[PDB]
Design a protein around this ligand. Structure first.
Ligand SMILES: Nc1ncnc2c1ncn2[C@@H]1O[C@H](COP(=O)(O)OP(=O)(O)OP(O)(O)=S)[C@@H](O)[C@H]1O
Ligand SMILES: Nc1ncnc2c1ncn2[C@@H]1O[C@H](COP(=O)(O)OP(=O)(O)OP(O)(O)=S)[C@@H](O)[C@H]1O
Ligand SMILES: Nc1ncnc2c1ncn2[C@@H]1O[C@H](COP(=O)(O)OP(=O)(O)OP(O)(O)=S)[C@@H](O)[C@H]1O
Ligand SMILES: Nc1ncnc2c1ncn2[C@@H]1O[C@H](COP(=O)(O)OP(=O)(O)O)[C@@H](O)[C@H]1O
Ligand SMILES: [Mg+2]
Ligand SMILES: [Mg+2]
Ligand SMILES: [Mg+2]
Lengths: 341, 330, 317, 292, 325, 269
């Protein structure tokens, strides 16, 4: 098929190449599915928490977990505004699509969790990216898992679980999924290239891919895919590690900020920021990447770096409550220019 | 069967372990019919829902659950009009007629109880509309408000409803309860596992019960017959090891930005929650007696600011890096 | 059945109305001439706008105004269709009016009337302005759409001076034959702040609750206005004096925190002695305290922190 | 069951309850249960009160088992009761039986219907928390301004014409004549102008009309009584007089109006509240224009 | 009717003489109704002052048997829109008398939640129909009311209940049910009242259930402080002394021991510290500014939630650092 | 694109043909309806996506001179037209039931318009009405909008057309529910069976129990919306008997059988 992300995906629970402590812990959890409480997974993005959830479902239910079952449901909010959600269905479990807007998120969650509950074995619900809720959907999930804790199980995967409210963190078991080290990523890549028998003279490129993706399985696999198809399935030690337009644009913006510090530079930074933000993206990761790229400049000293990180934290706090993002982004950029100049 | 959180949920008023005052007030109310409006508040997972359910079970009974009890939550629509009409309709219904069996067995009060959970997330207009319904219709009905945020409830509601604070379930407040649960479920602890679980838990018993259940499941799966140690519950609780915290403190002590940033990145790629790291760093810094007063005050202020930032739904990596940089430069 | 002084002693002719000599003289002149075009009357409430309009209509028409006009106020269904139909019928039905007289459409509290009704009124004027004229009684002219005001002569009523309110108070006192004290009258004027209706209500309350009108009785029944107290609080030099004033004037008197914040914001908007930077800093602090109050924290500590931060930004170390 | 009432002819109950439908947002009826019978009273904004009385002889199984002061109350909805009895009693020779039950206090209002081996049981929970009791827009008969007895058909035509034309404000005129030329009409003012619905003066359908001097015994001729009534109050009695035989009009000097509807037959009593004051001095021109 | 209701709705005044504290307002209203003139009374004040109880008692005293018909009660419980004020209020305030020529009273309880258009319609109603009907407006926030309405309504300020009114009501409650209360507990209840009758009644109802024997015993400071959970003044003084003389170790240990001995809350400790520090003499004003700002920030953070140990150490550090000036 | 057929008066199929009009009022009130003309005697029409499913077949074999042909390759052709204009042709044809048998109903598919020919006589009057829109859809939408769905078990056989009071009871449910403005059903396998409908509200407790009706696992509790008011109108079916099936606690069907064709309605949870 198309990508290594979904093709050579670990099917069975015994086919995990990562650390065995988490696998043993979830095997202990899956030993008695009747006594299994509500579960919450937190860790770095791209670690593969959904893979652990699918493996746990395989251990509890059995074969047939992966079923397409594309379904479309209609939901009505207050006044009159039709909403559409391409929620994915499956036997014995269902996954929630968080693609809906945060403001009108109560109706879909309430209706679909009531539909999965009914009155009646149990059916499990997987809710990815639970941090996007405005605490109203969080309260809805809290009440649903409190009152109907007889036939429903919630298994949520998320990264940077701080916005998740305290009551939910108390009622759900905390699963930690640390990102694999460079050795495990290199072993996985070696297994892949042995499976397809592609050309490979030096293993240093595998370590470069492993360490350049910051411990992300999907990013490393896709980076391997990009260079393999562009080199006629023949990796070379002299082949540079390519990066998306995202990192190139971020680095160019950082270089422009460091070099040129002026109002004209500020409005070109505004144009670049608008061009980036035109692709339906959150600004927290953009601010984090800009801060990390600014701290990577060798010409800066410790005082400028300290000021940059302090104002980055302050403007991230401002963005946490702010409705817009361009205000805080431009404020952080202007503060960085003021500090550098 | 059932998870230990719901399997061991109290069903009687005397099954509580720490909230003595509210429970004994309700018990002395059981022989009377002058129950006032109650405002239950406190830390999460202190058993306010369990307490109100036990009180309702002692008062009315399963026959009168479906006739004299209305519960409104966030699971359905909670608009101004819907809440207004529903509360006006239910708070106007006449006194129900219990059977002779109910009167013979349980003391049936002549009033009805309306329970409104998570009242903190209710709009001010709804509370203003419900003020007069609570006041002038209270002859044969009562309202119970349960919320973990007192400030989210406006001043007039805090006056009509009796304020029943729920104490934080500390170590000694739940040692006996965890011991009873361990004996009932055959869970073995060596010296201080239960005390360690309550120390880890933020003043609640539900998280501790879940942690104990996870530890018991792990011990049963291991099958070697040994007892649970403090290291196991610390690992399953997300507690940072002491050696790694010592390494963090040592790297912060050195005044270099590059090594600190690299180690912060290496720590964040492990996916550890920053709140636990902040708490462990704070308790280590206060516990240590090698620092003077000004440094302790400054680091306490920075830790409080970082905790507020983290609780405000911000990024853990940036906040922890900023906190460690600020600490290193003191 | 004792009718209250606000309704019992309301003026019936334009002669008894005081406060704006030029405007009353203009109204008398335009009534004597009779050529009264459309107009909009706006001002702060309690200055004598709608009663002036009613008196002008009275002494301009008489029996014709009493029997054959259609006066609409805010206590009616002010929908687009029904108002359109009603004014359309009222534009018709002409009588044997004098050549220098025209029908008057009294419009009381038109600030809350929908824009479609304003457009319907525009069409009604442009179609039958020859037979009838429109009179507008409102608080501010901003709520009236732009095209309506182009067809009318806007008249603005200034705030009543102390002399006119004092003269009206003496006339009402002579009519009622009640003892008074100059200190009590000065206190009544100070509490009214140019509000005639508030002054009448305060004087009536003093007379009916204590008898002789005195400064002590007025201060007992009603305290000083909160804008003055807040203005004195914001201009205090020492923080301890400001804290004591705040406590003993609003916390011990039963004043809500959100009302205190709103009054502080209103005072800071209209303050003039402070610099622009100080004014904007105080506005920012007031807004921060307001959002803290709205989010739930409504304790005295927030007000104390606001006062402390205001004093800190005023002193600037 | 502490209450029993069996009804076969549900058409009479259907048309009786249909007289209370013009009330907007119909609810909160204070049904009275007594040995004399069942009386339904409904008030809207404490300005108009209507009482509908059902006699004991109307029900063939009236028992009223009680050991109290014979004054018991319950509050339920109108729209539930109004649509409860109208749905059945269809086809021919169905002899539908309606059963009323109420277990004293705190029990739902039980309605049982039987129609060709088909059984229903409808329960209405009562609202008896803040029943203020007392109430009543009654009046004393010692100071009745005037009394009038008119046919239902004559008044129904006047009210029907009064509604569709509009006439948000209506006037009631009463005037006697020594030559037995009594004058009584329902005139009103609207956007159309002046409407004069002059009721007939002959004895064919106007049984009696006399004007008192505030003593209810001293009849006086040539005096005029002017009543200023809201249109909303008149719209409620329009359908009540649609099916009626005789309509009785009685008002006092205090301004309240009592309307008795006769249709043994049942009696419907409607009480109304006069408006504040006559617009301008229209009481002068009402006498002047009608006399012309 | 009695012995079946909460203590809040058990001692509600029924006559004008049963309302304490606002003696001037009661006397002025009594003079108003003795003369026979109601100047559109408007009641403003904090909750628990007794505005609605006073106005209901006054209406009962004026009317008697006419309360059911001629008196109209309005609130936020029922719908109050533009149509409601346009139709129901206009219809009610347009009728004549029935048995007595007394005025018509309409009770606008918690009227601050009405819309601006509804408020404008309401004030055009009060101006037009004032010759027979006088409205009464009850609200707690004057900023939500249209300023034109305040001009047409006689504003009366409801001050917080003084010490003598609270003591008189406490004595009346004790005499009715034959309950003994210690003077120290009386002073504690005076301090905790903060001018609120509902709070006093609610805590008095719960303290009755706290005692094992309802009679033949008294209520001391320990029972009062255990019932509601408020910190003892001695505990607050000890905490402040430990913070002042001990820097972090034994001070933090003492704070933790105090908080864990009974289950004290951080918020109530914060009001205790600010109450015992308001009378302190600090002639620098920078310590005062720092204390107020940092304590307000900590209270806001606690209201938003967080770690109890972190916030307690923040309070300790703020108090120690501010006093260093 | 030749879609030409003739509809003529008769004795038996007119009641089946006049039964089509009742939905047309509802279908016009709804969004629209789809059509699929196949072969010479099979065509399926339903309401596209509430949950309005009205799979119903009509035996066009008895119809005279009917032929379907289109450029849709396979035997199934997507067809859709607005049902509001269908009322006009049926209502006006219903007024001429007094006289006129040779008028017929000539329909011609031309491109968008469907001319309808009338030959009513009062000296003859010719009427030529045209259907406004016959717009088709995507060929792939035919598979995703398949209306053929049926279930088994828990068969309630309705009361045979001997007593007319059974239909009036269902017609009573039509008028009452419109006047108030959830519905619960019961099912039992104990022999004739009994039908029970119960409505639960805050203060409205309606329950109807049938003592001795002639209609024919257990405890099939189900909670559904008020969309069943349509299905009661389909029960009339004076020519034949109607079937009803309800099970699985989530879905219910109303199998209306008349002549060869059958009509079913689907209700979701
Ligand atoms: N006093 C107690 N004794 C024993 N178990 C308790 C006690 N209080 C709470 N629990 C346990 O806590 C759980 C019930 O707590 P909940 O009532 O659901 O939490 P909570 O009080 O609703 O907190 P919220 O609603 O999130 S603020 C059960 O597992 C109980 O066993
Ligand atoms: N110049 C004046 N002389 C005497 N009485 C006055 C004067 N102006 C106002 N009043 C009194 O004010 C009361 C009502 O005045 P209004 O005209 O209704 O107030 P207003 O200025 O129109 O403000 P609004 O918009 O109507 S609330 C009556 O009792 C009048 O007697
Ligand atoms: N002066 C008083 N004397 C005696 N009891 C009082 C007094 N003021 C209040 N109370 C009691 O407090 C209870 C509640 O106060 P209410 O008068 O009903 O409401 P309120 O004080 O007006 O505050 P709001 O504005 O309605 S929230 C009353 O039922 C009385 O029992
Ligand atoms: N134990 C494992 N061994 C090999 N690959 C793994 C393992 N766990 C996860 N992966 C890889 O992770 C990818 C899926 O990651 P995903 O679940 O999308 O991460 P996240 O849950 O953070 O979004 C798969 O393509 C799979 O190859
Ligand atoms: Mg709960
Ligand atoms: Mg005016
Ligand atoms: Mg009140």
């Amino acid at each position: 098929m198309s990508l290594w992300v979904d093709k050579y995906r670990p099917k069975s629970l015994n086919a995990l190449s990562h650390n065995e402590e988490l696998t043993n812990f979830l095997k202990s959890l899956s030993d008695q599915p009747r006594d299994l409480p509500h579960l919450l997974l937190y860790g770095p993005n791209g670690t593969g928490k959904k893979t652990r959830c699918m493996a746990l479902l395989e251990s509890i239910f059995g074969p047939g977990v992966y079923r397409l079952k594309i379904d479309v449901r209609q939901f009505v909010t207050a006044s009159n505004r039709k909403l559409e959600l391409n929620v994915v269905s499956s036997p014995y479990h269902l996954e929630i699509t968080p693609s809906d807007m945060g403001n009108n998120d109560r109706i879909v969650i309430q209706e679909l969790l009531k539909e999965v509950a009914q009155m009646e074995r149990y059916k499990c619900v997987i809710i990815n990216e639970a941090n996007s809720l405005t605490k109203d959907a969080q309260a809805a999930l809290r009440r649903t898992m409190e009152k109907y804790s007889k036939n429903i199980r919630l298994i949520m995967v998320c990264d940077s679980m701080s916005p998740i409210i305290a009551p939910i963190k108390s009622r759900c078991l905390l699963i930690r999924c640390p990102a694999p080290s460079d050795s495990e990523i290199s072993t996985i890549l070696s297994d892949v290239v042995t499976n397809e028998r592609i050309q490979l003279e030096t293993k240093d490129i595998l370590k470069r891919i492993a360490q350049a993706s910051n411990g992300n399985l999907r990013v490393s696999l896709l980076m391997l895919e990009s260079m393999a198809l562009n080199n006629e399935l023949a990796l070379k030690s002299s082949s540079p590690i390519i990066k998306p337009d995202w990192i190139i644009v971020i680095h160019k913006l950082t270089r422009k900020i460091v070099k040129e510090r002026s109002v004209n530079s500020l409005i070109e930074c505004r144009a670049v920021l608008y061009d980036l933000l035109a692709h339906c993206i959150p600004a927290n990761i953009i601010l984090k990447e800009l801060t990390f790229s600014l701290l990577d400049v060798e010409t800066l000293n410790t005082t400028n770096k300290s000021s940059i990180i302090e104002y980055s934290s302050v403007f991230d706090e401002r963005l946490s409550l702010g409705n817009k993002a361009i205000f805080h982004l431009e404020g952080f950029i202007a503060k960085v220019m003021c500090c550098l100049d | 069967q059932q998870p230990w959180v719901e399997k061991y949920r109290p069903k009687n008023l005397d099954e509580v372990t720490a909230q003595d005052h509210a429970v004994t007030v309700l018990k002395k109310t059981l022989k009377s019919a002058n129950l006032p409006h109650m405002l239950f508040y406190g830390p999460p997972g202190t058993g306010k829902t369990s307490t109100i359910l036990a009180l309702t079970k002692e008062l009315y009974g399963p026959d009168l659950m479906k006739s004299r009890i209305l519960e409104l939550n966030a699971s359905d629509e909670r608009g101004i009009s819907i809440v207004r009409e529903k509360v006006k309709n239910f708070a106007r219904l006449t006194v129900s007629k219990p059977s002779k069996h109910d009167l013979e067995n349980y003391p049936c009060p002549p009033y009805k109880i309306i329970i409104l959970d998570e009242a903190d997330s209710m709009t001010a207009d709804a509370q203003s509309a419900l003020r007069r319904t609570m006041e002038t219709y209270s002859g044969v009905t009562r309202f119970c408000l349960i919320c973990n945020y007192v400030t989210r409830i406006i001043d007039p509601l805090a006056s009509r409803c009796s304020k029943f604070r729920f104490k934080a379930l500390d170590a000694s407040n739940a040692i006996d309860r965890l011991r009873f649960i361990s004996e009932q479920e055959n869970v073995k602890c060596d010296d201080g596992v239960l005390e360690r679980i309550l120390d880890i838990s933020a003043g609640d018993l539900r998280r501790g019960i879940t942690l104990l259940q996870s530890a018991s499941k792990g011990a049963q799966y291991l099958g070697d017959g040994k007892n649970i140690t403090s290291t196991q519950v610390e690992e399953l609780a997300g507690v940072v090891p002491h050696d790694i915290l010592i390494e963090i403190v040592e790297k912060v002590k050195s005044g270099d930005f590059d090594e600190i940033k690299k180690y912060v990145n290496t720590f964040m790629k492990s996916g550890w929650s920053a709140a636990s790291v902040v708490n462990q760093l704070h308790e280590y810094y206060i516990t240590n007696d090698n620092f003077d007063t000004n440094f302790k005050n400054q680091i306490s202020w920075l830790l409080f600011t970082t905790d507020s930032r983290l609780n405000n739904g911000t990024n853990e990596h940036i906040q922890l890096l900023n906190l460690l940089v600020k600490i290193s430069q003191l | 059945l004792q009718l209250p002084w606000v309704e019992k002693y309301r003026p019936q002719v334009l002669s008894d109305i005081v406060g704006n000599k030029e405007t009353i003289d203009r109204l008398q002149q335009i009534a004597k001439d009779g050529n009264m075009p459309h107009m909009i009357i706006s001002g702060m409430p309690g200055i004598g706008k709608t009663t002036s309009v009613h008196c002008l209509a009275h002494e301009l028409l008489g029996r014709s105004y009493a029997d054959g006009v259609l006066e609409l106020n805010a206590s009616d269904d002010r929908g687009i269709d029904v108002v359109r139909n009603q004014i359309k019928h009222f534009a018709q039905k002409k009588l044997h009016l004098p050549p220098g007289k025209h029908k008057i459409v009294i419009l009381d509290e038109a600030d809350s009337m929908t824009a479609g009704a304003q457009q319907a009124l525009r069409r009604t004027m442009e179609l039958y302005s020859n037979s009838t004229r429109f009179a507008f009684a409102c608080n501010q002219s901003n709520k009236i759409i732009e095209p309506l005001q182009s067809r009318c002569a806007i008249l603005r009523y200034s705030k009543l001076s102390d002399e006119d309110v004092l003269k009206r108070l003496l006339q009402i006192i002579k009519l009622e034959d009640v003892k008074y004290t100059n200190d009590g009258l000065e206190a009544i004027i100070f509490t009214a702040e140019g509000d005639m209706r508030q002054a009448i209500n305060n004087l009536q309350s003093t007379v009916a609750g204590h008898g002789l009108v005195n400064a002590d009785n007025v201060f007992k029944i009603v305290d000083s206005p909160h804008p003055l107290i807040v203005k004195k609080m914001l201009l205090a030099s020492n923080l301890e004096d400001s804290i004591q004033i705040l406590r003993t004037d609003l916390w011990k008197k039963g004043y809500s925190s959100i009302d205190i914040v709103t009054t502080s914001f209103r005072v800071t908007k209209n303050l003039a002695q402070v610099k622009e930077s100080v004014r904007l800093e105080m506005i920012k602090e007031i807004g921060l305290t307001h959002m803290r109050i709205l989010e739930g924290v409504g304790t005295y500590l927030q007000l104390a922190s606001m006062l402390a931060k205001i004093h800190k930004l005023n002193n600037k170390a | 069951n502490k209450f029993s009432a069996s009804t076969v002819h549900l058409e009479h109950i259907t048309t009786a309850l249909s007289c209370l439908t013009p009330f907007g947002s119909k609810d909160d009826v204070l049904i009275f249960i007594d040995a004399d019978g069942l009386s339904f009273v409904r008030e809207n904004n404490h300005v108009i009160k209507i009482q509908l009385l059902l006699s004991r002889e109307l029900f063939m199984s009236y028992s009223y088992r009680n050991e109290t002061e014979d004054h018991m109350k319950l509050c339920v909805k109108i729209n539930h009761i109004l649509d409860s009895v109208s749905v059945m009693n269809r086809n021919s020779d169905d002899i539908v039986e309606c059963t009323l039950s109420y277990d004293g206090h705190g029990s739902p209002f039980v309605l049982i219907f039987e129609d060709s081996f088909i059984s229903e049981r409808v329960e209405y929970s009562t609202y008896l928390i803040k029943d203020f009791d007392t109430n009543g827009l009654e009046l004393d008969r010692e100071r009745i301004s005037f009394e009038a007895i008119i046919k239902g058909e004559a008044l129904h035509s006047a009210l029907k014409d009064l509604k569709e034309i509009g006439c948000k404000e209506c006037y009631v005129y009463a005037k006697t004549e020594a030559n037995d030329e009594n004058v009584f009409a329902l005139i009103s003012k609207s956007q159309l102008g002046f409407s004069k619905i002059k009721l007939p003066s002959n004895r064919s359908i106007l049984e009696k009309l006399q004007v008192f001097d505030g003593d209810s015994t001293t009849v006086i001729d040539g005096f005029a009584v002017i009543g200023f009534f809201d249109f909303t109050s008149f719209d409620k009695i329009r359908k009540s007089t649609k099916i009626a035989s005789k309509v009785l009009f009685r008002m006092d000097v205090h301004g309240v109006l009592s309307v008795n509807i006769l249709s043994p037959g049942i009696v419907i009593e409607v009480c109304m509240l006069e408006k504040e004051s006559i617009d301008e001095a229209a009481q002068t021109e009402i006498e002047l224009l009608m006399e012309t | 009717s009695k012995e079946n209701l909460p203590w809040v709705e058990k001692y509600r005044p029924e006559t004008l003489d049963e309302v304490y504290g606002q003696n001037e307002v009661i006397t002025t209203v009594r003079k108003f109704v003795d003369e026979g003139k109601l100047p559109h009374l408007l009641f403003y004040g904090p909750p628990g002052t007794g505005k609605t109880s006073t106005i209901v008692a006054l209406a009962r005293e004026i009317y008697g048997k006419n309360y059911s018909n001629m008196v109209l009660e309005l609130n936020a419980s029922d719908d109050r829109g533009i149509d409601v004020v346009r139709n129901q209020i206009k219809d009610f305030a347009s009728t004549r008398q029935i048995f007595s020529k007394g005025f018509k009273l309409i009770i606008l309880d918690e009227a601050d939640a009405m819309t601006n258009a509804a408020q404008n319609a309401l004030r055009r109603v009060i101006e037009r129909y004032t010759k027979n009907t006088r409205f009464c407006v009850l609200a707690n926030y004057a900023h939500k009311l249209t300023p034109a309405l305040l001009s047409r309504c006689t504003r009366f300020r409801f001050q917080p209940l003084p010490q003598e009114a609270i003591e008189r009501r406490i004595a009346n409650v004790l005499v009715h049910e034959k309950l003994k209360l210690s003077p120290n507990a009386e002073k504690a209840l005076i301090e905790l009242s903060n001018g609120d009758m509902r709070r006093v009644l609610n805590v008095l109802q719960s303290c009755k259930a706290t005692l094992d024997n309802p009679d033949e015993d008294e209520i001391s400071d320990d029972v009062i402080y255990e019932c509601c959970g408020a910190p003892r003044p001695s505990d607050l003084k000890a905490v402040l002394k430990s913070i002042l003389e001990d820097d972090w170790g034994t001070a933090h240990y003492t704070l933790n021991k105090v908080r864990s001995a009974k289950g004290l809350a951080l918020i109530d400790l914060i009001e205790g510290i600010v109450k015992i520090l308001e009378d302190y003499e600090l002639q620098n004003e920078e310590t005062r500014v720092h204390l107020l700002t940092k304590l307000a920030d900590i209270e806001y953070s606690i209201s938003k939630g967080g770690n109890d140990q972190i916030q307690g150490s923040a309070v300790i550090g703020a108090i120690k650092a501010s006093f260093e000036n | 694109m030749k879609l030409k057929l003739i509809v003529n008066g008769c004795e038996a199929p007119d009641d089946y043909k006049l039964l089509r009009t009742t939905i047309n009022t509802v279908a016009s009130l709804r969004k629209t309806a789809i059509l699929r003309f196949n072969s010479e005697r099979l065509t399926i029409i339903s309401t596209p996506k509430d949950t309005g499913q009205l799979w119903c077949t009509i035996p066009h074999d008895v119809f005279r001179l009917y032929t379907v042909i289109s450029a849709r390759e396979l035997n199934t052709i997507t067809m859709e037209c607005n049902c509001d204009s269908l009322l006009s042709v049926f209502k006006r044809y219903d007024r001429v039931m007094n006289q006129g048998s040779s008028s017929n109903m000539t329909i011609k598919l031309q491109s968008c318009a469907l001319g309808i020919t009338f030959e009513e006589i009062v000296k003859v009057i010719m009427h030529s009405f045209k259907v406004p829109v016959k717009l088709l859809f995507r060929a792939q939408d035919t598979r995703i909008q398949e209306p053929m769905i049926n279930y088994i078990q828990l068969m309630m056989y309705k009361l045979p057309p001997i007593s007319g009071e059974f239909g009036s009871a269902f017609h009573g449910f039509i008028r009452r529910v419109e006047r108030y403005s959830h519905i619960h059903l019961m099912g039992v396998k104990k022999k004739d069976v009994e039908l029970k409908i119960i409505v639960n509200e805050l203060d409205w407790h309606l329950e109807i129990c049938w003592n001795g009706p002639l209609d024919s696992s257990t405890h099939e509790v189900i909670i559904r919306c008020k969309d069943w008011k349509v299905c009661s109108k389909l029960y009339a079916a004076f020519e034949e008997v109607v079937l009803a099936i309800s099970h699985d606690e989530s879905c219910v069907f109303h199998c209306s059988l008349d002549e060869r064709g059958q009509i079913i309605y689907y209700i979701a949870r």
